[PDB]
Amino acid sequence: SMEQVAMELRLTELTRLLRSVLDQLQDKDPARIFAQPVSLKEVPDYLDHIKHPMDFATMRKRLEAQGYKNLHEFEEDFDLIIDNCMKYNARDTVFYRAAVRLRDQGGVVLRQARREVDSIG
């Protein structure tokens, strides 16, 4: 139908906007701490601690399959990256500190994204 197509154009455009959001958030991680999944070879107990692992590469795969229906779903995954790290790693670590800085800097980006998603519909 013509409606299904219209819907698909909206999802494509959301995907376009979320791709630019993802790029801006990932720039706030210049150490690449969150770029890839935590290695289960190198942290074999990880899934005993963290039940829903997340990382920027995993988000990008979902994004490119148009697997984010709305900004809320995308933000859920970004929040997992941060919250997983802040639980597994102690306060005095470069990993925890990196997550705090990503959260703080990402806030700005996500605030305007929400306005843009509502604005453009």
mmCIF file of all heavy atoms in Angstrom, residues 55-85, unseen atoms left out:
data_model
loop_
_atom_site.group_PDB
_atom_site.id
_atom_site.type_symbol
_atom_site.label_atom_id
_atom_site.label_comp_id
_atom_site.label_asym_id
_atom_site.label_seq_id
_atom_site.Cartn_x
_atom_site.Cartn_y
_atom_site.Cartn_z
ATOM 1 N N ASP A 55 26.866 -2.150 23.210
ATOM 2 C CA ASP A 55 28.051 -1.392 22.731
ATOM 3 C C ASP A 55 27.690 -0.682 21.403
ATOM 4 O O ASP A 55 26.660 -0.993 20.820
ATOM 5 C CB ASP A 55 29.209 -2.358 22.507
ATOM 6 C CG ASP A 55 28.926 -3.287 21.379
ATOM 7 O OD1 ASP A 55 28.301 -4.333 21.620
ATOM 8 O OD2 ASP A 55 29.192 -2.927 20.172
ATOM 9 N N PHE A 56 28.531 0.236 20.950
ATOM 10 C CA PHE A 56 28.159 1.003 19.810
ATOM 11 C C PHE A 56 28.099 0.185 18.509
ATOM 12 O O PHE A 56 27.285 0.492 17.599
ATOM 13 C CB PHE A 56 29.091 2.189 19.574
ATOM 14 C CG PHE A 56 28.948 3.328 20.531
ATOM 15 C CD1 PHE A 56 30.060 3.870 21.202
ATOM 16 C CD2 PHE A 56 27.727 3.952 20.718
ATOM 17 C CE1 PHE A 56 29.919 4.979 21.990
ATOM 18 C CE2 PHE A 56 27.593 5.067 21.536
ATOM 19 C CZ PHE A 56 28.720 5.581 22.190
ATOM 20 N N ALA A 57 28.939 -0.839 18.352
ATOM 21 C CA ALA A 57 28.868 -1.646 17.141
ATOM 22 C C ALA A 57 27.553 -2.428 17.036
ATOM 23 O O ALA A 57 26.962 -2.553 15.967
ATOM 24 C CB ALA A 57 30.067 -2.583 17.051
ATOM 25 N N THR A 58 27.100 -2.907 18.187
ATOM 26 C CA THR A 58 25.846 -3.699 18.277
ATOM 27 C C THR A 58 24.720 -2.727 17.930
ATOM 28 O O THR A 58 23.801 -3.087 17.198
ATOM 29 C CB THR A 58 25.742 -4.407 19.612
ATOM 30 O OG1 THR A 58 26.874 -5.291 19.768
ATOM 31 C CG2 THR A 58 24.467 -5.221 19.783
ATOM 32 N N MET A 59 24.767 -1.477 18.421
ATOM 33 C CA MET A 59 23.682 -0.513 18.113
ATOM 34 C C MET A 59 23.661 -0.193 16.630
ATOM 35 O O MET A 59 22.610 -0.087 16.007
ATOM 36 C CB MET A 59 23.873 0.810 18.881
ATOM 37 C CG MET A 59 23.658 0.706 20.411
ATOM 38 S SD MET A 59 23.655 2.268 21.284
ATOM 39 C CE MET A 59 22.235 3.091 20.571
ATOM 40 N N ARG A 60 24.851 -0.106 16.043
ATOM 41 C CA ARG A 60 24.929 0.258 14.650
ATOM 42 C C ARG A 60 24.310 -0.853 13.782
ATOM 43 O O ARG A 60 23.690 -0.572 12.780
ATOM 44 C CB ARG A 60 26.362 0.576 14.291
ATOM 45 C CG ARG A 60 26.468 1.328 12.950
ATOM 46 C CD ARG A 60 27.916 1.799 12.787
ATOM 47 N NE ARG A 60 28.352 2.841 13.730
ATOM 48 C CZ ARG A 60 28.071 4.147 13.640
ATOM 49 N NH1 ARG A 60 27.278 4.610 12.672
ATOM 50 N NH2 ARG A 60 28.554 5.004 14.546
ATOM 51 N N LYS A 61 24.509 -2.102 14.153
ATOM 52 C CA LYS A 61 23.929 -3.237 13.401
ATOM 53 C C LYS A 61 22.405 -3.137 13.447
ATOM 54 O O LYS A 61 21.747 -3.242 12.426
ATOM 55 C CB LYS A 61 24.374 -4.586 13.951
ATOM 56 N N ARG A 62 21.868 -2.886 14.633
ATOM 57 C CA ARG A 62 20.436 -2.716 14.763
ATOM 58 C C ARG A 62 19.937 -1.510 13.972
ATOM 59 O O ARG A 62 18.950 -1.605 13.257
ATOM 60 C CB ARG A 62 20.034 -2.685 16.196
ATOM 61 C CG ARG A 62 18.570 -2.510 16.412
ATOM 62 C CD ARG A 62 18.177 -2.900 17.825
ATOM 63 N NE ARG A 62 16.793 -2.446 18.102
ATOM 64 C CZ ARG A 62 16.224 -2.367 19.296
ATOM 65 N NH1 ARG A 62 16.874 -2.660 20.412
ATOM 66 N NH2 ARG A 62 14.966 -1.929 19.388
ATOM 67 N N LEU A 63 20.614 -0.408 14.070
ATOM 68 C CA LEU A 63 20.217 0.781 13.347
ATOM 69 C C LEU A 63 20.111 0.508 11.836
ATOM 70 O O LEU A 63 19.118 0.857 11.199
ATOM 71 C CB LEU A 63 21.262 1.847 13.593
ATOM 72 C CG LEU A 63 21.092 3.184 12.918
ATOM 73 C CD1 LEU A 63 19.855 3.853 13.461
ATOM 74 C CD2 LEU A 63 22.295 4.095 13.078
ATOM 75 N N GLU A 64 21.117 -0.148 11.281
ATOM 76 C CA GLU A 64 21.184 -0.353 9.822
ATOM 77 C C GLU A 64 20.200 -1.380 9.295
ATOM 78 O O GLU A 64 19.847 -1.345 8.117
ATOM 79 C CB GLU A 64 22.612 -0.697 9.405
ATOM 80 C CG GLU A 64 23.604 0.450 9.524
ATOM 81 C CD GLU A 64 23.155 1.809 8.940
ATOM 82 O OE1 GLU A 64 22.326 1.839 8.010
ATOM 83 O OE2 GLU A 64 23.671 2.864 9.386
ATOM 84 N N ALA A 65 19.715 -2.258 10.162
ATOM 85 C CA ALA A 65 18.591 -3.089 9.880
ATOM 86 C C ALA A 65 17.265 -2.330 10.129
ATOM 87 O O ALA A 65 16.228 -2.995 10.313
ATOM 88 C CB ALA A 65 18.593 -4.301 10.812
ATOM 89 N N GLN A 66 17.310 -0.985 10.255
ATOM 90 C CA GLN A 66 16.134 -0.219 10.743
ATOM 91 C C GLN A 66 15.374 -0.830 11.923
ATOM 92 O O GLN A 66 14.118 -0.842 11.939
ATOM 93 C CB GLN A 66 15.157 0.020 9.549
ATOM 94 C CG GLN A 66 15.862 0.780 8.451
ATOM 95 C CD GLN A 66 14.966 1.183 7.282
ATOM 96 O OE1 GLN A 66 13.869 0.689 7.142
ATOM 97 N NE2 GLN A 66 15.418 2.149 6.505
ATOM 98 N N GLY A 67 16.120 -1.313 12.931
ATOM 99 C CA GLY A 67 15.572 -1.955 14.058
ATOM 100 C C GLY A 67 15.203 -1.053 15.234
ATOM 101 O O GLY A 67 14.731 -1.548 16.245
ATOM 102 N N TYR A 68 15.398 0.266 15.102
ATOM 103 C CA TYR A 68 14.882 1.191 16.118
ATOM 104 C C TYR A 68 13.546 1.833 15.627
ATOM 105 O O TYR A 68 13.578 2.664 14.744
ATOM 106 C CB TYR A 68 15.913 2.249 16.521
ATOM 107 C CG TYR A 68 17.145 1.665 17.250
ATOM 108 C CD1 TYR A 68 18.399 1.742 16.695
ATOM 109 C CD2 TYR A 68 17.035 1.084 18.512
ATOM 110 C CE1 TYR A 68 19.517 1.177 17.345
ATOM 111 C CE2 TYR A 68 18.169 0.498 19.196
ATOM 112 C CZ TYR A 68 19.392 0.594 18.581
ATOM 113 O OH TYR A 68 20.506 0.043 19.193
ATOM 114 N N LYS A 69 12.466 1.497 16.273
ATOM 115 C CA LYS A 69 11.125 2.072 15.886
ATOM 116 C C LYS A 69 10.909 3.520 16.288
ATOM 117 O O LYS A 69 10.190 4.247 15.624
ATOM 118 C CB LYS A 69 9.995 1.227 16.445
ATOM 119 N N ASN A 70 11.536 3.938 17.386
ATOM 120 C CA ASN A 70 11.385 5.279 17.913
ATOM 121 C C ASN A 70 12.688 5.620 18.668
ATOM 122 O O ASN A 70 13.529 4.729 18.863
ATOM 123 C CB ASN A 70 10.180 5.334 18.824
ATOM 124 C CG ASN A 70 10.189 4.237 19.899
ATOM 125 O OD1 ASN A 70 11.151 4.118 20.686
ATOM 126 N ND2 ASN A 70 9.124 3.428 19.954
ATOM 127 N N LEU A 71 12.855 6.879 19.027
ATOM 128 C CA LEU A 71 14.038 7.351 19.786
ATOM 129 C C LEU A 71 14.168 6.676 21.152
ATOM 130 O O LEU A 71 15.305 6.445 21.639
ATOM 131 C CB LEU A 71 13.960 8.836 20.024
ATOM 132 C CG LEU A 71 15.108 9.506 20.761
ATOM 133 C CD1 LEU A 71 16.458 9.243 20.120
ATOM 134 C CD2 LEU A 71 14.896 11.004 20.902
ATOM 135 N N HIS A 72 13.063 6.386 21.794
ATOM 136 C CA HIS A 72 13.059 5.705 23.118
ATOM 137 C C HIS A 72 13.842 4.395 23.087
ATOM 138 O O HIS A 72 14.689 4.151 23.978
ATOM 139 C CB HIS A 72 11.625 5.473 23.684
ATOM 140 C CG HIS A 72 11.613 4.837 25.032
ATOM 141 N ND1 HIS A 72 11.948 5.526 26.177
ATOM 142 C CD2 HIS A 72 11.383 3.560 25.412
ATOM 143 C CE1 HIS A 72 11.891 4.707 27.211
ATOM 144 N NE2 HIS A 72 11.548 3.506 26.774
ATOM 145 N N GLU A 73 13.581 3.559 22.081
ATOM 146 C CA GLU A 73 14.301 2.277 21.922
ATOM 147 C C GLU A 73 15.830 2.487 21.775
ATOM 148 O O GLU A 73 16.592 1.699 22.332
ATOM 149 C CB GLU A 73 13.802 1.468 20.733
ATOM 150 C CG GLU A 73 12.378 0.911 20.913
ATOM 151 C CD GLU A 73 11.937 -0.040 19.792
ATOM 152 O OE1 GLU A 73 12.562 -0.010 18.725
ATOM 153 O OE2 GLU A 73 10.965 -0.824 20.001
ATOM 154 N N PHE A 74 16.238 3.474 21.001
ATOM 155 C CA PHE A 74 17.619 3.845 20.786
ATOM 156 C C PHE A 74 18.235 4.325 22.091
ATOM 157 O O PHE A 74 19.336 3.871 22.486
ATOM 158 C CB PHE A 74 17.723 4.908 19.702
ATOM 159 C CG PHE A 74 19.094 5.405 19.393
ATOM 160 C CD1 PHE A 74 19.841 4.884 18.355
ATOM 161 C CD2 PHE A 74 19.620 6.469 20.111
ATOM 162 C CE1 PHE A 74 21.052 5.425 18.005
ATOM 163 C CE2 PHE A 74 20.860 6.977 19.811
ATOM 164 C CZ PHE A 74 21.591 6.461 18.764
ATOM 165 N N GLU A 75 17.565 5.228 22.776
ATOM 166 C CA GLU A 75 18.057 5.666 24.083
ATOM 167 C C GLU A 75 18.178 4.550 25.094
ATOM 168 O O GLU A 75 19.112 4.581 25.942
ATOM 169 C CB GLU A 75 17.166 6.763 24.678
ATOM 170 C CG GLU A 75 17.217 8.059 23.940
ATOM 171 C CD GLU A 75 16.171 9.050 24.494
ATOM 172 O OE1 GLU A 75 14.991 8.698 24.761
ATOM 173 O OE2 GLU A 75 16.520 10.198 24.608
ATOM 174 N N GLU A 76 17.266 3.579 25.062
ATOM 175 C CA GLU A 76 17.391 2.428 25.956
ATOM 176 C C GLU A 76 18.762 1.725 25.805
ATOM 177 O O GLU A 76 19.451 1.450 26.813
ATOM 178 C CB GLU A 76 16.252 1.437 25.725
ATOM 179 C CG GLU A 76 14.940 1.915 26.332
ATOM 180 C CD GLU A 76 13.892 0.814 26.435
ATOM 181 O OE1 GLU A 76 13.891 -0.122 25.608
ATOM 182 O OE2 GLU A 76 13.094 0.890 27.394
ATOM 183 N N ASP A 77 19.127 1.488 24.560
ATOM 184 C CA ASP A 77 20.410 0.824 24.233
ATOM 185 C C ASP A 77 21.570 1.741 24.661
ATOM 186 O O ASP A 77 22.589 1.249 25.205
ATOM 187 C CB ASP A 77 20.486 0.428 22.756
ATOM 188 C CG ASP A 77 19.903 -0.945 22.508
ATOM 189 O OD1 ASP A 77 19.498 -1.673 23.492
ATOM 190 O OD2 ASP A 77 19.901 -1.318 21.305
ATOM 191 N N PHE A 78 21.481 3.035 24.412
ATOM 192 C CA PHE A 78 22.612 3.922 24.840
ATOM 193 C C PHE A 78 22.778 3.895 26.376
ATOM 194 O O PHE A 78 23.885 3.748 26.912
ATOM 195 C CB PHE A 78 22.362 5.349 24.355
ATOM 196 C CG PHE A 78 23.390 6.330 24.775
ATOM 197 C CD1 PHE A 78 24.661 6.219 24.342
ATOM 198 C CD2 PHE A 78 23.073 7.363 25.603
ATOM 199 C CE1 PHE A 78 25.636 7.107 24.722
ATOM 200 C CE2 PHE A 78 24.039 8.310 25.990
ATOM 201 C CZ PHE A 78 25.317 8.173 25.534
ATOM 202 N N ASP A 79 21.656 3.932 27.073
ATOM 203 C CA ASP A 79 21.666 3.872 28.516
ATOM 204 C C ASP A 79 22.266 2.536 29.005
ATOM 205 O O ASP A 79 22.935 2.573 30.042
ATOM 206 C CB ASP A 79 20.256 4.101 29.066
ATOM 207 C CG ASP A 79 19.815 5.564 28.954
ATOM 208 O OD1 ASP A 79 20.643 6.485 28.877
ATOM 209 O OD2 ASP A 79 18.603 5.763 29.055
ATOM 210 N N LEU A 80 22.048 1.414 28.299
ATOM 211 C CA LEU A 80 22.640 0.145 28.667
ATOM 212 C C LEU A 80 24.168 0.216 28.646
ATOM 213 O O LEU A 80 24.843 -0.330 29.500
ATOM 214 C CB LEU A 80 22.212 -1.048 27.765
ATOM 215 C CG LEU A 80 20.901 -1.722 28.109
ATOM 216 C CD1 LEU A 80 20.681 -2.780 27.034
ATOM 217 C CD2 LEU A 80 20.972 -2.391 29.472
ATOM 218 N N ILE A 81 24.681 0.840 27.603
ATOM 219 C CA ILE A 81 26.148 0.964 27.471
ATOM 220 C C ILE A 81 26.690 1.601 28.759
ATOM 221 O O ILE A 81 27.662 1.094 29.374
ATOM 222 C CB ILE A 81 26.532 1.802 26.247
ATOM 223 C CG1 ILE A 81 26.178 1.040 24.953
ATOM 224 C CG2 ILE A 81 28.014 2.138 26.295
ATOM 225 C CD1 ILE A 81 26.419 1.760 23.684
ATOM 226 N N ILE A 82 26.100 2.728 29.161
ATOM 227 C CA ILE A 82 26.560 3.507 30.321
ATOM 228 C C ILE A 82 26.337 2.751 31.627
ATOM 229 O O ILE A 82 27.238 2.660 32.523
ATOM 230 C CB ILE A 82 25.775 4.838 30.408
ATOM 231 C CG1 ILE A 82 26.009 5.688 29.131
ATOM 232 C CG2 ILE A 82 26.096 5.614 31.678
ATOM 233 C CD1 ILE A 82 27.442 5.773 28.681
ATOM 234 N N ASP A 83 25.069 2.281 31.799
ATOM 235 C CA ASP A 83 24.706 1.688 33.068
ATOM 236 C C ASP A 83 25.448 0.369 33.314
ATOM 237 O O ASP A 83 25.838 0.105 34.444
ATOM 238 C CB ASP A 83 23.181 1.516 33.095
ATOM 239 C CG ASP A 83 22.450 2.808 33.147
ATOM 240 O OD1 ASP A 83 22.970 3.879 33.536
ATOM 241 O OD2 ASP A 83 21.223 2.759 32.844
ATOM 242 N N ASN A 84 25.691 -0.416 32.284
ATOM 243 C CA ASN A 84 26.408 -1.706 32.382
ATOM 244 C C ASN A 84 27.820 -1.389 32.912
ATOM 245 O O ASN A 84 28.348 -2.006 33.857
ATOM 246 C CB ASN A 84 26.492 -2.477 31.107
ATOM 247 C CG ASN A 84 25.165 -3.108 30.638
ATOM 248 O OD1 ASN A 84 24.213 -3.179 31.406
ATOM 249 N ND2 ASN A 84 25.112 -3.443 29.391
ATOM 250 N N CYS A 85 28.441 -0.408 32.290
ATOM 251 C CA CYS A 85 29.818 -0.032 32.667
ATOM 252 C C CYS A 85 29.921 0.447 34.068
ATOM 253 O O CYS A 85 30.916 0.114 34.792
ATOM 254 C CB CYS A 85 30.232 1.067 31.690
ATOM 255 S SG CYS A 85 31.992 1.561 31.912
#
